[PDB]
RNA sequence: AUCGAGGACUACCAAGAUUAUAACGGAUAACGAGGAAUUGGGGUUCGACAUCGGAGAGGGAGCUUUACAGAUGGCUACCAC
RNA sequence: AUUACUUUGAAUAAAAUAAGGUGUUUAAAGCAAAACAUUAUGUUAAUGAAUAUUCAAGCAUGGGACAAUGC
RNA sequence: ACCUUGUUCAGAACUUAAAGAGAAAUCUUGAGUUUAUGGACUUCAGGGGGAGUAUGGUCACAAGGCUGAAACUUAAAGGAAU
């Protein structure tokens, strides 16, 4: 670009827009989360971009469907980000 | 008993009878002659314990090891008591200021002391008197290397 | 406790000291740095080289704090 | 494929200065790349540089100040004897007072001036005006 | 770019800048090893074994927990397959294409891609022999691979 | 056998040796080198001929004397003079 | 641990090339002649250019950055 | 799903340039980073004809394909633009 920004201190917004690899220090866009079951109270921890059917550990209200890039959680499944 | 496979009787160059327990020359046996070659080369245990006979082995004969000393990789082990050693070196062409890869084959004599010597092994050779039309070197030590499903021993 | 072994160099002359790789200066200092920080975890590392009296000064700064090397531990500057 | 990382770095730096850019980024960092920059700093051709650690042979950011006309690497690093120095400078450098070669020697990576002082030759890396 | 066609994609994974296990992870190496051990006995590739742990057990990186890679773990337990996983899957595709080619003799694109696949096999087999993974007596043959791959 | 190593030659034994890093062949109006001409650097071309080494005495071949010769301003035989 | 690279050397026929001295009347040459001692005497037991080379190999030495075979 | 927008990855393209290059036409996802000449590797060319011809070798049922000169002749042949 003709106009140039600092290459050591990129903004929070600028790094978020960039590709997951083309950042200053590459970081994954994925995360680990747990899903409370609709059927029971147990929380099953799983990858954000899981590539298989996600079942509860108790039963199996299947909690997610793998769809080419991110888990398709059911509309009644609530999750939080595991930090 | 196993080394007497030729038409003549095989003897060492320096064959002498040992003394018996009573202190007199025992003509019923012959001492196994073994010498040590020079510049930092150890005599393999086979040249001491072994019963082979060779008149060109540097450890159990009167062949000397002279100044020239080289190294290489065993190429062929099909001929009896003889191997072919290949040396890979770089030749400098002055005009282009670049080296080019070259190779030369040296026919060297392999004594039966080195029994575990196969194709592809790294071998240190020394220069001796002409022992054949082309064989003018002798194997002094060898190190085994990786295998290629063709274990062609000497 | 960890030991940084001596190396052979090429012309050498001498012997080896059994270095595996866990006994390298890089690994030992990194192992000390991680173990020393423990609860804390290091997520950045930047080295700044500048001229000081005609000599280069590699100012290593362990960054994001969430042996013989002078380092400057600090948090994200703007995050 | 990336055969010479130093060639990639010096082409990035030269391209940045022709466009007047303030700072440039080099993705693969090496010891040799760092040594080449240190030689260029001692002659005050670049202000400074910083090295970020990405756990993957991290990146280098170099600050430029209107002074680096051209820094280029030299393909296969010829074995430069001490008597062949002035033959190389007469070919690669603009004059007898301006530029400096870079050589890798057993005493480190040094330019032609102090390698002559230390009385040692070696492979040639590159140059800069 | 790719080895055999002019395609150029950069679809990769991005390991985080944290070589240690995350704070929220509590399972020790004993559970990780045995869970991985049970999966190996079921006939699962090492690449798929790690994915199952990541998706189900939340162990996304095994080297961050146990300090050693999956293949090293499997070798210590002796459950590493004799034929390396990447080479095994390549010979599984060469067999499958060849079987289709027996009935469809006129398919000229399958003959081309079978040639590319077999060239890959001879590249991997040569490398693994220099790495001493495969004994020098190993050799890929069409009349033989149908049985071992099966 | 030779002054002597050695397939240099003989008897028996084995199947070996070289080759795309150019073997085996073909050409040279080719004796090799120190060197010579011209050259910013790199190079290109030449070297029968001062000096060092090799080979020859019209063509091969075989020998004598002697410490040294397969000698030819020594000998024998054949070919051309 | 070797090799390669690099720095110093060892050893290596002259002539030739470069180059040191020397008024062959200059010069190309030669390696002699003299400068002054008014020279037998004395410099003097006078000069011999250190004469340097020099590539591709070979031998030894200090360094291990860049490289190959490590194992 | 279809459609309108922000970001980003891959693909075939297009427009502008007082800039870079080139003999110019033009090129810009290069034909740029080259007398400030060196990122890695392979193939090909040496004025126009004779001529991809003759001969030799090899492949093919054949037409032909691959390799491939010399004698001689000639101050031009050719490229982009006004």
UniProtKB/Swiss-Prot annotation, chain A:
Cytoplasm in keyword set: yes
Naturally occurring in which organism (per UniProt): Entamoeba histolytica (strain ATCC 30459 / HM-1:IMSS / ABRM)
Superkingdom of the source species: Eukaryota
Annotated S-S bridges: none
Subcellular location: Cytoplasm
Alphabetical list of InterPro entries matching this protein: Ribosomal_eS27, Ribosomal_eS27_Zn-bd_dom_sf, Ribosomal_zn-bd
One GO cellular component term noted in the UniProt record for this chain: cytosolic small ribosomal subunit
Gene3D superfamilies: Zn-binding ribosomal proteins
This protein's UniProt keywords: Cytoplasm, Metal-binding, Ribonucleoprotein, Ribosomal protein, Zinc, Zinc-finger
Similarity annotation: Belongs to the eukaryotic ribosomal protein eS27 family.
Protein name: Small ribosomal subunit protein eS27
PANTHER family reported for this sequence: 40S RIBOSOMAL PROTEIN S27 (PTHR11594)
Signal peptide location: none
Gene: RPS27
GO BP: any one term: translation
Subunit structure as annotated in this protein's UniProt entry: Component of the small ribosomal subunit.
Role played: Component of the small ribosomal subunit. The ribosome is a large ribonucleoprotein complex responsible for the synthesis of proteins in the cell. Required for proper rRNA processing and maturation of 18S rRNAs.
Cofactor, how bound (note): Binds 1 zinc ion per subunit.
Gene Ontology molecular function terms on file: RNA binding; structural constituent of ribosome; zinc ion binding
Cofactor: Zn(2+)
Zn finger (C4-type) location: 37-59
